[PDB]
Design a protein around this nucleic acid. Structure first.
Ligand code: NA
Ligand code: NA
Length: 327
DNA sequence: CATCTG
DNA sequence: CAGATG
């Protein structure tokens, strides 16, 4: 956790590159297991050889561990931090809708900056254009005080469209958190569940109210159960307009809401432990349901939930307010 | 995993 | 349809 931090960090650096710049998924996966194992590893790694002793740790990595332990640096690391190509890729990637792949193509056509991008808006798709157009806004965290304003709008709008909807804003917003990255709304309806053959209007209707009142400004991706957009708290009495924020709206069969809501609410560590405990209590859980575990090894059949409460009950545990869902 | 692009 | 992105 700090006893082999650098090592794990370099490894992580190295890995990112293999994957992002080279196309080296193998090597890429290579670095990861390695960090992963050195990460658990209980002692101070004093040498490459010592490391090698571990699984995932090979000759090449043991090598790198030496030079890094030997001198505060790694040549390779040094050469890669320079390399404009590598850096251009780490950079384009920051645009929403540009991934490694697109990054590579862009750079090889010589587009390596924001300006490059603007000049060449034509070679970019809808998501990408949008992503460029709000490069700034999108990198700006979202302060909780804004979140409560967004939430308030969304909830009131869904309500008007149909009293029967059930919307919930998950994420750390939910677990307390002072600011956040984007807004994720978990949506459900009584008239939509597991078997129920669809209802697309279910989602489309909401999305539409949201734009009607101008809260949603652009669409990134709009499916029949998942919507990826851009919203904006209306600018008050003009002088201060708000940054453009990312928003996710997802439709969920009512019969599996609280499991999602539970899940989406995180934190990742929270889930894990809860999940690991579930397993103890003769259960299984995932993003959609909780299932009684047979002894034949496995076995299913969806226990029925009415709240996040039901879930806890089942695994016989302390109902935890979102706030303490930390770890 | 769900959506989009080409 | 494969393949990319979030
Ligand atoms: Na990106
Ligand atoms: Na293939």
């Amino acid at each position: 956790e700090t006893l082999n931090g650098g090592i794990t960090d370099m490894l992580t650096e190295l890995a990112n590159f293999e994957k992002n710049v080279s196309q080296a998924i193998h090597k890429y996966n290579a670095y990861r297991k390695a960090a992963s194992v050195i990460a658990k590893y209980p002692h101070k790694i004093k040498s490459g050889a010592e490391a090698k002793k571990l699984p995932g740790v090979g000759t090449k990595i043991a090598e790198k561990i030496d030079e890094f332990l030997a001198t505060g640096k790694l040549r390779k690391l040094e050469k890669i931090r320079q390399d404009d190509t590598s850096s251009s890729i780490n950079f384009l990637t920051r645009v929403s809708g540009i991934g490694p792949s697109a990054a590579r193509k862009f750079v090889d056509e010589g587009i390596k900056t924001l300006e490059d991008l603007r000049k060449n808006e034509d070679k970019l798709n809808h998501h990408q254009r949008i992503g460029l157009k709000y490069f700034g806004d999108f990198e700006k965290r979202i302060p909780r005080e804004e979140m409560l304003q967004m939430q308030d709008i969304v909830l009131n709008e869904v309500k008007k469209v149909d009293s029967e909807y059930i919307a919930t804003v998950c994420g750390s917003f939910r677990r307390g958190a002072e600011s956040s990255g984007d807004m994720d709304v978990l949506l459900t309806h009584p008239s939509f569940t597991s078997e129920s053959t669809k209802q697309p209007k279910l989602l489309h209707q909401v999305v539409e109210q949201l734009q009607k009142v101008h809260f949603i400004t652009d669409t990134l991706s709009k499916g029949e159960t998942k919507f990826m957009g851009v919203c904006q708290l209306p600018s008050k009495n003009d002088e201060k307009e708000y940054p453009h924020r990312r928003i996710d709206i997802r439709l969920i069969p009512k019969d599996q809401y609280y499991c999602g809501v539970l899940y989406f609410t995180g934190s990742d560590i929270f889930n894990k432990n809860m999940r690991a405990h579930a397993l103890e209590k003769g259960f299984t859980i995932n993003e959609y349901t909780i299932r009684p575990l047979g002894v034949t090894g496995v076995a299913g059949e969806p226990l029925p939930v009415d709240s996040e409460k039901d879930i806890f009950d089942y695994i016989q545990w302390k109902y935890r307010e979102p706030k303490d869902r930390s770890e």
